[PDB]
Design brief:
- The longest helix has 12 residues.
- The chain has 166 residues and is an alpha+beta fold.
- Strands 3-4-6-5-7-2-1-8 form an eight-stranded antiparallel β-sheet.
- It has two helices and eight strands.
- It is 12% helix and 30% strand.
- It is classed as isomerase.
- The entry lists the keywords Cytosol, isomerase.
- It forms a monomeric assembly.
Length: 166
């Protein structure tokens, strides 16, 4: 896989229960614009970001999705560059533990992302893979088993209580 050039983390909690820390390595050389956006949303440098946001969608044996810190339902989010930015590299395929940008078509990247927990070939070529879980995969797997409902949303908020650069 591509070279890791920076590391960010998420501290996750599910209603009083601390799950642990997820460490994500970013592919800075293969996706500078995408990684910088993710990085700065983690630190909250611009006044907004991932701290105190949730993983609004969970689909077992597929992925977990978060990043909508404006509407908390999958319809919001925003990049540091503005509303949306272009797809940087679509040639990197997904793999277990990949961090990838969610979107609503070509060049509509904002702040939403997902972490895959299984092969997802049907996403290859259409979503920019910008990093991977270097540590805390067990935490990702734990989140994946959380009870959901119609719409695949956790019954109890899966909250990112802290985020930043390591």
């Amino acid at each position: 896989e591509p070279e890791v050039t920076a590391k960010v983390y998420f501290d996750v909690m599910i209603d009083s229960e601390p799950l642990g820390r997820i460490t994500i390595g970013l592919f800075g050389k293969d996706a500078p614009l995408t990684t910088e956006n993710f990085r700065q949303l983690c630190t909250g440098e611009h006044g907004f970001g991932y701290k105190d946001s949730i993983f609004h969608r969970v689909i077992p044996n597929f992925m977990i999705q978060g990043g909508d810190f404006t509407n908390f339902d999958g319809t919001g989010g925003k990049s540091i560059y503005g509303e949306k930015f272009a797809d940087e590299n679509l040639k990197v395929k997904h793999f277990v533990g990949a961090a990838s940008m969610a979107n609503a078509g070509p060049n509509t990247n904002g702040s939403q992302f997902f972490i895959t927990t299984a092969p997802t070939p049907w996403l290859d070529g259409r979503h920019v893979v910008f990093g991977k879980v270097l540590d805390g995969m067990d935490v990702v797997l734990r989140i994946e088993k959380t009870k959901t409902n119609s719409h695949d949303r956790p019954v109890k908020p899966v909250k990112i209580v802290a985020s930043g650069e390591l």
